[PDB]
Amino acid sequence: STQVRGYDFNRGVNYRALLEAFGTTGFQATNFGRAVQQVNAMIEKKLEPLSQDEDQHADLTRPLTSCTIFLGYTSNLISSGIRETIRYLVQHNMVDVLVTTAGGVEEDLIKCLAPTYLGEGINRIGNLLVPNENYCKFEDWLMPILDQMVMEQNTEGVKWTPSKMIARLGKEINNPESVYYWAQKNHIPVFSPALTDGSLGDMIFFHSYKNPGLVLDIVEDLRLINTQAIFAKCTGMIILGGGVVKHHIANANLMRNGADYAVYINTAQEFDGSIRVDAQPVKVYADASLVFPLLVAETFAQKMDAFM
Amino acid sequence: STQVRGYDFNRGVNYRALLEAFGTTGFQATNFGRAVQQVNAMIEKKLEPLSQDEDQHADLTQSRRPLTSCTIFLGYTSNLISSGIRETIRYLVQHNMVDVLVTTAGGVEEDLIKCLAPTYLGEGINRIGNLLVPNENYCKFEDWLMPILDQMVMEQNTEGVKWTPSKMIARLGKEINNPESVYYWAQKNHIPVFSPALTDGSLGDMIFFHSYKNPGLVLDIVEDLRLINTQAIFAKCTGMIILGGGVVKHHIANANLMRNGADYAVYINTAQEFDGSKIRVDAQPVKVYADASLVFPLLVAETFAQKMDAF
Amino acid sequence: STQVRGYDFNRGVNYRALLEAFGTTGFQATNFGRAVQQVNAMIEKKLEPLSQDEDQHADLTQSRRPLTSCTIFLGYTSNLISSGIRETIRYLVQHNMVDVLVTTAGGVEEDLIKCLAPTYLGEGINRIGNLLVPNENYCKFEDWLMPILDQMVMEQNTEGVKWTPSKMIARLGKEINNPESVYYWAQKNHIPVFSPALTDGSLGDMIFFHSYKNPGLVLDIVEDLRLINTQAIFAKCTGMIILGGGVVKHHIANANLMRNGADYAVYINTAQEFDGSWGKIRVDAQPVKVYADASLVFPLLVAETFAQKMDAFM
Amino acid sequence: STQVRGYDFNRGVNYRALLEAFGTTGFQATNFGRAVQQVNAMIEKKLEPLSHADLTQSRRPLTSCTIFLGYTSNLISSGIRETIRYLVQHNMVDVLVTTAGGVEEDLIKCLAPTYLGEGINRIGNLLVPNENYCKFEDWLMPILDQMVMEQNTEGVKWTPSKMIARLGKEINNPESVYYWAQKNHIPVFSPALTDGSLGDMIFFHSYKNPGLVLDIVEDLRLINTQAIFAKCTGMIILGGGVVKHHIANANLMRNGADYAVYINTAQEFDGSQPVKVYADASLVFPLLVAETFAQKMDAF
Ligand SMILES: CC(C)C[C@H](CN)n1ccc2c(-c3cccnc3)cccc2c1=O
Ligand SMILES: CC(C)C[C@H](CN)n1ccc2c(-c3cccnc3)cccc2c1=O
Ligand SMILES: CC(C)C[C@H](CN)n1ccc2c(-c3cccnc3)cccc2c1=O
Ligand SMILES: CC(C)C[C@H](CN)n1ccc2c(-c3cccnc3)cccc2c1=O
């Protein structure tokens, strides 16, 4: 059994030892240390070379690795500075699939046009402020792209889905601060059935009266996200801010393995009800704005050289 | 200014007086009393007669549902459909007391599955909090669903049907043909159901599996985007009752869309604010910080169920 | 196995059937139904006829309260006394439906102050969640309190009184002499009130100020430690109803003290577990926890339990 | 206005820059950055040279900022016990306040360890073997005998703070928070001292050796004189509302806190300017100390 012991500041400030001491500190500090262990296990799996046999399985679809990592996050984390943390992972191909919620696409693209501010015509998101002007700049940028998307649908047989639209918006924003710029550049698909539930939806709706008939099919994206999970050698999940992806994915009939590694960081409670098996997930009960940068510092950022 | 005073049990037990006394009890009891007041205000607005030969904008809404003086949006998380709140929601939909439903992944199939086999109390099983759904329930559902999915794909070819989540949910409600089903009553009463996340759970696993046996099903979210927005834009007045989480974010006022803010908005959930989880403005919402499994039946008893005669 | 089924409003509004249907609704509704079952079992145990040597228990407990077949401890946070749940608690104490009260800093003075001036709904003021207590209410209480503290110090110094929080709370309840007061009824019915944190808030500010005018008041917690323990040790059976937080931690079973675990334990609060917040001794029964604001749940619980057995307490 | 921007890991892992970037990250990360600013302001005030003992009835010399450190007992069961012990060891705080269990869980750890989980006492994901309490009871009983004798023969008027100082002196172990508090004349307040296991043992002891008195009114005067004679007041309150923020009282000559940080996961909705970080203090408090007190070790 491991004894409870906190970091001793009589040693001075050794940041690596202080962060490792979370594991023996207890409560959510211990969950954080278990999350670091799970994510380091994911990364070490991902960096294992595929055999010529495994490599063959992999190509039945970006290059397959030994661990396909799904990174799911709520839109609020894109409004926060965690946008930079996510952009870094996507930029360096450290994760394979993104899943987000309503607002999670446009809040990244808008930040390329105008900043979000700290608080305590304004959109308030917790202690953040997005001036209404930011949405106006975004709408002016978006409308011509929606025109091209409808023309391509009608003249070049394009069958749009949320993931194909998000790839197109990332290509158009053409800005290395953008999560979605890097995802499309690095062939990391982005899934968001809720893509139209917020401001981007208001704009697509408005656009549809002057230029009707845009179709966004969710069933083709249903097949694409499943293909990422079914053809994976191994599956990891890092899910932030809420239940963006429920942990139970193991499905014998679909040939879909459970995740070998799963980390959840959120402040949701269980009490109101909010093939390889599904591994026991690690849950850190904490604001991901605090915890996710610390997790990335102790895991992905330690293996930067291997992803360059 | 209103004095804090709880119900006096020396009066014995008058449930109406006990429930009204929540308003002066404080903390979330007071919020419950304010939620009762807001929903009763919504209902009284809805029951106001609408102006003579009123422009329906049936051509603008593409809906067969007649306009009332207050369009009520009822949003709820799937977990509430697994709970007994399924019965509470089914009652409101059955009596045309709400106009639009919005739900999350699982919120459709957990209602339909309960028509085939029961969900059980806990403490091959799917655990949802203290509830248990036997895996066999999903097997029965899949056997029932596959032939309907076949008909839906063929109707794209034979009838020019352009499926959306709302149109699929109405079809599944018609097929289940069971008056215990929320979705049976919604399609019978022309109450549309919106759920872009329709395919994110077990129903999605089945649609995915079916799509290799019978390819072609398209579910378009943009036509549903237009349908849900036109319900809010052509509303004379808007009410929102949102349960279990942020199924719908409160700020809907949009001058460019001529979309009024809600005049009345009630939220019942246990989510925290601290981690960030011309047109009429968005009225200040009432939030009751509580499990909707406790609060929603009490809310309905003191509001909709009091005005059953008018519906 | 019990099927999940909510109340069907097609039956109309039958409040008793609606409240019973919480049991089959799931999530915290089911926990509420379990809490009603546990409290009804506590009350039915309490109402079972006893035989016992009255003088004998009295000399061991140093209490005038007669033993029943179940000793019920009611614990609550001070915020619930600021709320309308003050009326709910006062009712239970008035009718001798509970045996012992335990509260936290503020839980005594917020009841006494309401006898002098009202607390108001919000959304010089003390804000307690969405409640407002005007600062003037505390000034009226201070004016009322100072002469009583003078008498308490005189009785200590001339009549050998050894003050404890429970003895002080009984004296304040006697002095307020107002049937709206929880503490008026507790002292009238010989229900002791325990609060080691009695002086951590406004009442403490006033005791502190008074000690400059009239020094040497002693409030001993060790004699109260013995009084609360003897209530639990000489209990035939123990129930706990704990509101608003962990006012009393549920594990009380102690072989060395001959202190039985609770046979029935109900907790109503919104606290989380995640941040760490010989067949002769009865075990600690598994508690029922309802994750809910007690301001909503406690009156419903009382309606379906204690209020149904009012006849047996007359 | 400050722009929202997270730490860019393209810059590599620079821990000081990463921790500062919490300030511009938003949500509770921003609150953490504000908490570091408030505590650094407290420390800078405390280290200002000053231009009392008969008024406070304390041997502790006044500084330019009196810091009250309040914490729930669960944090003493956690590894935050080490973080608290460090601050007390180096006289970086002036007054401790805790809740039921917060004294004995420090002393018991000097006799036997607490273990990680997921005859055992469970405290969240921590395990305290029942034998730990048995070793503590064996150690405690002789001290209680001496305390009652000193009361009855040497006129000692015990209070929770005087008992906690005595237990810290007796444990005589530099891993103990309460050892360092009594060594450094840092008083510890706990009216709830007897609500838990230590109370069970004092109660048991009272049968064979009756009449121990623990007075709370003398402690009421001692904690107030710490606040009244303060030039400036800082509060660091962990795990819950151990001390409510509003202390300003004109009639008592008691100033409000100039600086206040609260770290806990309590919600305001059921009725349970300071900086509040809504977070488990087991995660946040070591980071806060690393960027504040530990940076100024030389000055202490
Ligand atoms: C993780 C997935 C491979 C499996 C899992 C099965 N429950 N699953 C599927 C889709 C899925 C989607 C989705 C659906 C359709 C189109 N675009 C995205 C979105 C969010 C979560 C999931 C999700 O959790
Ligand atoms: C409530 C709505 C009238 C406006 C509001 C604007 N933020 N809005 C829009 C769509 C919407 C949708 C949606 C989108 C597309 C297809 N089916 C459903 C789903 C959930 C929430 C919203 C939602 O909150
Ligand atoms: C409930 C009790 C019989 C036993 C239990 C043992 N853990 N216990 C004891 C005292 C106790 C007290 C107390 C202490 C001293 C004076 N006045 C009140 C206060 C709050 C909780 C408890 C409490 O939880
Ligand atoms: C911080 C204090 C100077 C003033 C403040 C006024 N509300 N105050 C007082 C006592 C106090 C005590 C206390 C009381 C008596 C004996 N031992 C400790 C415990 C906890 C918090 C407080 C507390 O918050």
- Of chain A, the end-to-end C-alpha distance in Å amounts to 39
Look at residue C216 and give its three-state secondary structure: coil
Strands A261-266 and A235-240: parallel
Nearest chain A Cα distance for residue B220, angstroms = 5
Inter-residue contact C95 to C313 (CB < 8 Å):
yes
Closest ligand 3 atom, residue D200 Cα = 6
Compute CA B300 distance to the chain's CA centroid, rounded to the nearest angstrom: 13
Write out chain B residues lying below 8 Å of D262, CB-based. Answer: none
Planar angle of CA A78, A82, A85, nearest 5 degrees = 120
DSSP secondary structure code for residue C3 in this structure: B
Q: Is C244 left (phi over 0), alpha (psi -120 to 50) or beta?
A: left
Q: Is C232 left (phi over 0), alpha (psi -120 to 50) or beta?
A: alpha
Residue whose CA is at the smallest distance from ligand 1 atom 19: B200
- d(Cα D126, Cα D112) in Å, to the nearest integer? 14
Token digits of residue B90: 């089914």
Residue B147's closest CA among B171, B167, B178?
B171
Please tell me if the CB atom of residue A198 comes closer than 6 angstroms to any atom of ligand 2.
Answer: yes
Q: Mutual orientation of helices A219-230 and B202-213 as an angle, nearest 10°? A: 90
Is B307 assigned a catalytic role?
no
Residue whose CA is at the smallest distance from ligand 4 atom 10: C200
Phi, psi angle pair for D105, to nearest 5° = -65, -30
According to the annotation, is B276 in a ligand binding site?
Answer: yes
Q: How many CA atoms lie within 13 A of A126 on its CB side?
A: 25
Residue B214's closest CA among B149, B167, B158, B156?
B149
- Indicate the burial class of B177 (C-beta count within 10 angstroms; 0-12, 13-18, 19 or more): exposed
Closest Cβ–Cβ partner in C27, C272, C274 for A272: C27
Instruction: Work out whether the CA dihedral C77, C78, C83, C84 comes out positive or negative.
Output: positive
Q: Which of C162, C280, C289, C309 is catalytic?
A: C280
Phi, psi angle pair for C238, to nearest 5° = -125, 130
Inter-residue contact D178 to D103 (CB < 8 Å):
yes
Please tell me if the CB atom of residue B257 comes closer than 6 angstroms to any atom of ligand 2.
Answer: no
Distances in whole angstroms, Cα of residue C125 to Cα of each of C108, C139, D35: 19, 12, 27
- d(Cα D86, Cα D75) in Å, to the nearest integer? 14
**A117-118 β-sheet, strand order:** A117-118, A128-131, A122-125
Residues contacting C88, CB < 8 A, separation 6+: B6, B7, B9, C298, C299, C302
Question: In testing the pocket of ligand 2, which one of A135, A197, A204, A215 has its CB within 8 Å of the most ligand atoms?
Answer: A197
- d(Cα B178, Cα B176) in Å, to the nearest integer? 6
Residue from C5, C8, C9 to probe the interface with B (highest B Cβ count within 10 Å): C9
DSSP C92-112: HHHTT--SEEEE-TTTTHHHH
- d(Cα A169, Cα A146) in Å, to the nearest integer? 10
- d(Cα D101, Cα D109) in Å, to the nearest integer? 12
Residue whose CA is at the smallest distance from ligand 3 atom 8: D195
DSSP D40-102: HHHHHHHHSPP--HHHHT--PPP-S-EEEEEE-HHHHHSTHHHHHHHHHHTT--SEEEE-TTT
Neighbours of D149 (CB within 10 A): 12
- Are A30 and D282 inside 8 Å of each other by CB? yes
Write out chain D residues lying below 8 Å of A296, CB-based. Answer: 9
Q: Is B164 left (phi over 0), alpha (psi -120 to 50) or beta?
A: beta
Token digits of residue B265: 């908005």
Q: Which amino acid is at A264?
A: Y
- d(Cα A71, Cα C24) in Å, to the nearest integer? 37
- d(Cα C233, Cα B223) in Å, to the nearest integer? 70
Q: Which helix (H) or strand (E) holds C296?
A: helix C294-304
Say which residue the tokens 């369009």 belong to: B71
Strands A261-266 and A282-285: parallel
- Of chain D, the end-to-end C-alpha distance in Å amounts to 36
Compute CA A175 distance to the chain's CA centroid, rounded to the nearest angstrom: 18
Please tell me if the CB atom of residue C67 comes closer than 6 angstroms to any atom of ligand 3.
Answer: no
Interface of C with B in 229-288 (CB under 8 A): 270
Residue from C208, C211, C252, C290 to probe the interface with D (highest D Cβ count within 10 Å): C208
According to the annotation, is B104 in a ligand binding site?
Answer: yes
Q: Which helix (H) or strand (E) holds C240?
A: strand C238-243
- Are B222 and A196 inside 8 Å of each other by CB? yes
Nearest chain B Cα distance for residue A176, angstroms = 26
- Are B118 and C3 inside 8 Å of each other by CB? yes
Residue B25's closest CA among C173, D296, C121, C214?
C121
Planar angle of CA D244, D245, D248, nearest 5 degrees = 110
D26 touches chain B (CB under 8 A): yes
Residues contacting B252, CB < 8 A, separation 6+: B232, B238, B240, B259, B260, B261, B262, B282
Q: Which amino acid is at C312?
A: A
Q: Please give the method by which this entry was determined.
A: X-ray
Q: Which of B45, B213, B278, B307 is catalytic?
A: B278
Distances in whole angstroms, Cα of residue D71 to Cα of each of A194, B232, C130, D238: 43, 50, 26, 5
Token digits of residue C237: 């059976």
Residues contacting B204, CB < 8 A, separation 6+: A222, B105, B198
Residue from C125, C213, C222 to probe the interface with D (highest D Cβ count within 10 Å): C222
Please tell me if the CB atom of residue B234 comes closer than 6 angstroms to any atom of ligand 2.
Answer: no
Please tell me if the CB atom of residue C72 comes closer than 6 angstroms to any atom of ligand 3.
Answer: no
Q: Which amino acid is at C308?
A: Q
C66 touches chain B (CB under 8 A): no
Strands A122-125 and B71-76: unpaired
Q: After which residues is chain D broken (C to N over 2.5 A)?
A: 51, 118, 272
Residue whose CA is at the smallest distance from ligand 3 atom 7: D196
- Of chain B, the end-to-end C-alpha distance in Å amounts to 35
Neighbours of A141 (CB within 10 A): 16
Inter-residue contact C80 to C247 (CB < 8 Å):
no
- Are D72 and C277 inside 8 Å of each other by CB? yes
Instruction: Work out whether the CA dihedral B236, B237, B243, B249 comes out positive or negative.
Output: positive
Inter-residue contact A98 to A167 (CB < 8 Å):
no
Residues contacting B120, CB < 8 A, separation 6+: B131, B132, B133, B134, C1, C2, C3, C4
Nearest chain D Cα distance for residue B31, angstroms = 10
- d(Cα B5, Cα B1) in Å, to the nearest integer? 13
- d(Cα D215, Cα B56) in Å, to the nearest integer? 77
Write out chain C residues lying below 8 Å of A27, CB-based. Answer: 274-276
Residue B250's closest CA among B234, B230, B271?
B271
Closest Cβ–Cβ partner in C26, C295, C299 for B130: C26
Phi, psi angle pair for B161, to nearest 5° = -70, 130
Inter-residue contact B100 to B192 (CB < 8 Å):
yes
DSSP secondary structure code for residue C295 in this structure: H
Q: Which amino acid is at D218?
A: E
Residues contacting A59, CB < 8 A, separation 6+: none
DSSP 3-state percent helix, strand, coil across chain C (nearest 5): 45, 15, 40
- d(Cα D71, Cα D241) in Å, to the nearest integer? 9
Inter-residue contact B133 to B82 (CB < 8 Å):
yes
Inter-residue contact D133 to D197 (CB < 8 Å):
yes
Planar angle of CA B48, B54, B58, nearest 5 degrees = 110
What would you measure as the largest C-alpha separation in chain A, in angstroms? 71
Inter-residue contact B246 to B79 (CB < 8 Å):
no
Token digits of residue A173: 């924003």
- Are C257 and D203 inside 8 Å of each other by CB? yes
Write out chain D residues lying below 8 Å of A2, CB-based. Answer: 115-116
Subunits with 3+ C-beta pairs closer than 8 A to C: A, B, D
D174 touches chain A (CB under 8 A): no
Please tell me if the CB atom of residue B225 comes closer than 6 angstroms to any atom of ligand 2.
Answer: yes
- Are D270 and B26 inside 8 Å of each other by CB? no
According to the annotation, is D83 in a ligand binding site?
Answer: no
Subunits with 3+ C-beta pairs closer than 8 A to B: A, C, D
Inter-residue contact B219 to A219 (CB < 8 Å):
yes
Q: Which value in Å is the resolution of this experimental model? A: 1.6
Write out chain C residues lying below 8 Å of D133, CB-based. Answer: none
Residues contacting C130, CB < 8 A, separation 6+: B26, B27, B30, B31, C121, C122, C123, D271
Residue D266's closest CA among D279, D254, D255, D275?
D279
- d(Cα D156, Cα C105) in Å, to the nearest integer? 27
Provide the β-strand partners of residue C125. Answer: C134
Inter-residue contact C94 to C166 (CB < 8 Å):
no
Residue B304's closest CA among B3, B82, B96?
B96
Structural domains of chain D sorted by starting position, each given as residue range(s) with its CATH number in brackets? 9-299 (3.40.910.10)
- d(Cα D80, Cα D286) in Å, to the nearest integer? 7
- Are B7 and C88 inside 8 Å of each other by CB? yes
Distances in whole angstroms, Cα of residue D112 to Cα of each of D105, D128, D135, D193: 10, 9, 8, 21
Question: In the 3-class helix/strand/coil scheme, how is chain B assigned residue by residue?
Answer: CCECCCCCHHHCCCHHHHHHHHHHCCHHHHHHHHHHHHHHHHHHHHHCCCCCCCCCCHHHHCCCCCCCCCEEEEEECHHHHHCCHHHHHHHHHHCCCCCEEEECCCCCHHHHHCCCCCCEECCCEEEECCEEEEHHHHHHHHHHHHHHHHHHHHHHHHCCCCCCHHHHHHHHHHHHCCCCCHHHHHHHCCCCEECCCCCCCHHHHHHHHHHHHCCCCCCECHHHHHHHHHHHHCCCCEEEEEECCCCCCCCCCECCCCECCCCEEEEEECCCCCCCCCCCCCCCCEEEECCHHHHHHHHHHHCHHHHHHHC
Residues contacting A100, CB < 8 A, separation 6+: A72, A73, A74, A75, A78, A190, A191, A192, A244
Token digits of residue B192: 């549309």
What would you measure as the largest C-alpha separation in chain C, in angstroms? 70
Inter-residue contact A165 to B225 (CB < 8 Å):
no
- Are D124 and C226 inside 8 Å of each other by CB? no
Residue C193's closest CA among C162, C168, C219, C159?
C168
Distances in whole angstroms, Cα of residue A121 to Cα of each of A129, A133, D107, D266: 10, 8, 57, 32
Residue from D162, D272, D278 to probe the interface with C (highest C Cβ count within 10 Å): D272
Instruction: Work out whether the CA dihedral D134, D137, D142, D143 comes out positive or negative.
Output: positive
Q: How far is the CA of C91 from the centre of ligand 1 (A)?
A: 53
According to the annotation, is B245 in a ligand binding site?
Answer: yes
Q: Which helix (H) or strand (E) holds C193?
A: strand C193-194
Residues contacting D171, CB < 8 A, separation 6+: D107, D110, D178, D179
According to the annotation, is D76 in a ligand binding site?
Answer: yes
Instruction: Work out whether the CA dihedral D30, D31, D35, D37 comes out positive or negative.
Output: positive
Compute CA C168 distance to the chain's CA centroid, rounded to the nearest angstrom: 16
Token digits of residue C111: 């009841």
Write out chain C residues lying below 8 Å of B12, CB-based. Answer: 307, 310
Residues contacting D252, CB < 8 A, separation 6+: C205, C208, C209, D224, D228
- d(Cα A233, Cα A55) in Å, to the nearest integer? 9
Strands B264-269 and B238-243: parallel
Q: Mutual orientation of helices A27-47 and A288-298 as an angle, nearest 10°? A: 50
- d(Cα B168, Cα B112) in Å, to the nearest integer? 13
- Of chain C, the end-to-end C-alpha distance in Å amounts to 39
According to the annotation, is A101 in a ligand binding site?
Answer: yes
C15 touches chain A (CB under 8 A): no
DSSP chain D: -PBP----GGG---HHHHHHHGGGT-HHHHHHHHHHHHHHHHHHHHHSPP--HHHHT--PPP-S-EEEEEE-HHHHHSTHHHHHHHHHHTT--SEEEE-TTTTHHHHHTTTS--EE---EEEETTEEEEHHHHHHHHHHHHHHHHHHHHHHHHH-----HHHHHHHHHHHH--TT-HHHHHHHTT--EE-TTTTSSHHHHHHHHHHHHS-----BSHHHHHHHHHHHHS-SSEEEEEESS-SS-S---BTTTTBPPPSEEEEEE---TTTT---EEEES-HHHHHHHHHHHTGGGGGGG-
- d(Cα A284, Cα A264) in Å, to the nearest integer? 6
Inter-residue contact A80 to B276 (CB < 8 Å):
yes
Distances in whole angstroms, Cα of residue C263 to Cα of each of C51, C103, C266, C286: 20, 21, 10, 8
Inter-residue contact C113 to C140 (CB < 8 Å):
yes
- d(Cα A79, Cα C233) in Å, to the nearest integer? 57
Closest ligand 3 atom, residue C165 Cα = 17
- d(Cα D138, Cα C94) in Å, to the nearest integer? 44
Phi, psi angle pair for C121, to nearest 5° = -75, 135
Residues contacting B59, CB < 8 A, separation 6+: none
Neighbours of A305 (CB within 10 A): 6
- Indicate the burial class of A56 (C-beta count within 10 angstroms; 0-12, 13-18, 19 or more): exposed
> Nearest 10 degrees: CA dihedral of A218, A219, A224, A227?
140
- Are D278 and B289 inside 8 Å of each other by CB? no
Neighbours of D206 (CB within 10 A): 18
Ligand number nearest to the C-alpha of A193: 1
Inter-residue contact B119 to B131 (CB < 8 Å):
yes
Residue A70's closest CA among A303, A281, A298, A285?
A281
